[model samples]
Target: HHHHHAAEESPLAEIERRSGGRLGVFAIDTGSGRTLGHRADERFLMCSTFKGLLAAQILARVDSGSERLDRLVHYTEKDLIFTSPVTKANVAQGAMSIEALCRAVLVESDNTAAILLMRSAGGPAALTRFVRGLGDTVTRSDRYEPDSNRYHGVLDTTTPKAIAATAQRLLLGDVLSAGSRARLERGMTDCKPGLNRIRAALPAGWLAADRPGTSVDRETNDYALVRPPGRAPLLVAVYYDAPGVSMDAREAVLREAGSAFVQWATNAG
Candidate 1:
């Protein structure tokens, strides 16, 4: 007699089964060379998620002595152009430290802070060069935060694989100094937005340091470093874009995909 058990479907397949949306997913184990991908090379608008990359670039400058994290930067009316709890709280203060600005970008996803850091890192062109240097050929930072309007055709874009690469390099590799890497990791882990994306499906006691992006319903992206106890951490990147799809459906796809990925990682060991 043979016992029958249903085989599990892949996370990517589940995502496709749930919605008429396009998705890209990439996951890796840093300790091993194992990888999982579905349309991971496909490009998608990055939205505010690029701020995490921007933070890495900025911190690189700090490590090189080209910039100082403790340096003070004044906030002008120009910096007040987008949504930012950090800018609102500190508008009266008129300035903030570079480290604080980096925190604002990662923790609050503040547009003003992102713009400030980009300028300090030598503008979008310089950031593009930096990302390319990391062996990511497609990720581009052509526009600053406030001006990155995908609807208007001016946007920053990246692939799930590119994001996963950056996260792996910055978090698990030696791309930045120990102090710089720690700072970036702290900011990412403290991210305050997108509770419905990767964070929603993480198991209890697990920790994920992630950055999420949203630009209308057509762009929903997140990349994360998920740590499960007693196992090597995993890097996961997910992107979903589908116009006319309800937010509820989009979030459901992300939640299920994230949960499925975690389950796979747990068993892959």
Candidate 2:
């Protein structure tokens, strides 16, 4: 992803106004295919949103005839080790389709679902291959457990540019079959944990598909706010790695920054 200026000014100032010294901005003008940045392109720790890429990779395998979506898989206790709100909601229900797991990963940002999908989709090597094939070199999955050779980490790592590119490719239908991509996009739009930055910024009548990532480092926190295409076909990625702000404050800043970016980008080009 080359950096080209298509917009007149940086949105960072607006983010600062909204965040009051507690935000990091990483916005790209997808409409013009240009970047509007000021620390906006820098990489931060991507939390659960890593599941977005993981889901795409899994679905890509299904689309390639290498895997079957309907194959039933059991959810073991180990899968629920670090229970996410999503996993707790779905896994306890019983066996699920690979397609459903993919949906869970996207819509709910389920960590357990991600592990299951990755295992069924050819494990870490295949996932790494899928992500690298997309030309995203900055993103990598981590080891889930220290001793397991097969463990590809509990979560994937990413930068803003890499994630933004991943979202763009998803919208462009380059990651999976047209039908699968469309379905995944729709599922993402209906996702939960609505108390995040990207979803908070969405304007009325605007259907947005977004995944939020939150990483906690002791008392400090980092977040990623992303929006997938919907009615407006907008893509906003903001990464916040700051200390001493409450989760609510972080989310408010993200929403306001995203709103500002959308407002400015729509009229910039």
Candidate 3:
């Protein structure tokens, strides 16, 4: 497929130049329906972004009246002691509802909250059903327990194309009801302390619906620009897996990339 990066300010080119071939960039233009930098066919780990899918799936159930977000749920010490900040704050503390858990999972990228919600939603098998119903064949949810030899991460795995497509579907209101979409949008807007690839690119006044994914010493970030009607939204995904790099340094790189990309897109339009 053809790529249409804007002049010398291409987000993809800049990221590659900065990382010296240790980076991958994916982008989409929602209005023009164009993708600039990489193929939508390539797959990457969804990381925390998978929480967005989880949120959608769960909300769909709620919209269909199969579940209620206001219902109370309990958390265990195991859930709290997990490495997820969301679980640590809400679930583990026993101060969260199903809606709150979903928000914490998607917006805050909380691993513990994600696992709790996954279990509540009927585990990875149910998430698989969610993804399949969305018509995504390239994405899969990893199991949440490490001892089971199945998927072991709180966040599931997916490809750049699949994720971006999912974002598009959400934006187009193809995934859930209007109320559910509003809830998802509000949850995305409420995320604090975000440095994901997508979040880093948005201007201060602009809102981002983003989720971050990181591995040991490596990270992949994805976000979509939430814009007013008639304006095109910018969707982006970037991965960094360089050695000996601290998470702080990685965040700085992503933030700079986001700033540059936002400027490029703003000017290009």
Candidate 4:
């Protein structure tokens, strides 16, 4: 699985060493088919980052006519979970359209929005199926949020390369219809770019549509579809796990790695 990363190993090793924990990354120059990865085949927890793909699944259903974007769904306080950042405020209204829930999940990582959509899309199994359908055989989503946040578990685990590839299919490839893909791109691109670990270090002219996931003790990840000016887009997937480190330090690992990917993506032949 190695592809031109020998010179890249020292930087990756240093990032992992800085955290005193593991780090994984897999990135592709979608236009050129160049790749860089460190332990890209290994499994790691995806956390709330899975929300982006979950939204894709719902959109797929919409494209298929099994679901409608304007379909309004009602939720009570009972459906709320610890991480319902967006849904909590709107719960008093008792309803949101399917499209709005997609934004809540992608832009806000709203747990209640995720659960409601997971229920509508047929639960955790549906997400796993969606990934497989995208030709990502290694990524698996087995549980809902909170439960799935357990560090490095058999459940809700995926390889960095697997997720990067799946994101490419969902965002760049033909797996999703144009309208559905646009809906997703809007959410992921708007998904708190201020909170974007990948975007944090990227320079101007580098646009990232990213999904970031965080867990206790600084288990962090960012999956991105990056456009470096006029060249073809790049897919960057980075994950870090250091249960003992603070979030600030852990996220720096991702930020630094992200910059390195920028170096690679922009300069590599």
Looking at model 3, report the run of 10 residues with the lowest lDDT sum.
Answer: 145-154
For model 4, which pairs clash? none
TM-scores for candidates 1 onward, in order: 0.91, 0.79, 0.81, 0.95
Any idea what lDDT model 1 has?
Answer: 0.82
Tens digits of lDDT, candidate 1, 1-269 = 12632233355765775697788888888878677777778888888888889999999999999989889988876578667889778988888999999999899899888887876778888888988888778888787655574745434788898889988988888999999999998998899886788889999999889998877657778889888888788999988887888776777777877887887677762
Best model per lDDT: 4
Cα-lDDT of candidate 3:
0.65
Clash count in backbone of candidate 2: 8
Model 3 steric clash total: 2
Better of 1 and 3 by TM-score: 1
lDDT (0 to 1) per candidate: 0.82, 0.62, 0.65, 0.86
How many clashing residue pairs appear in each of the predictions shown? 0, 8, 2, 0
**Model 2 alpha-carbon miss at residue 111, Å:** 1.9
Model 2 — TM-score against the truth? 0.79
Q: What does candidate 4's lDDT look like per residue over 112-164, in tens digits?
A: 99999998889989899988888888888888778789954568988899999
lDDT of each residue in 1-269, candidate 3, tens digit only: 14755553355566656664255555667777655443335445555667777888888889888889998768866666344676675544675788888888767777777777887788878887887877877677766633221223534556666776777777564668888988887787776646455575576676566666665445545556456344766666655544566777776676766665566566553
C-alpha positional error of residue 230 in candidate 2 after TM-score superposition, expressed in Å: 12
Ranking by TM-score: 4, 1, 3, 2
After superposition, which runs of candidate 3 have C-alpha atoms over 4 Å from their true positions?
1-11, 89-95, 145-156, 195-197, 228-230, 267-269
- Candidate 4, TM-score vs. the true structure? 0.95
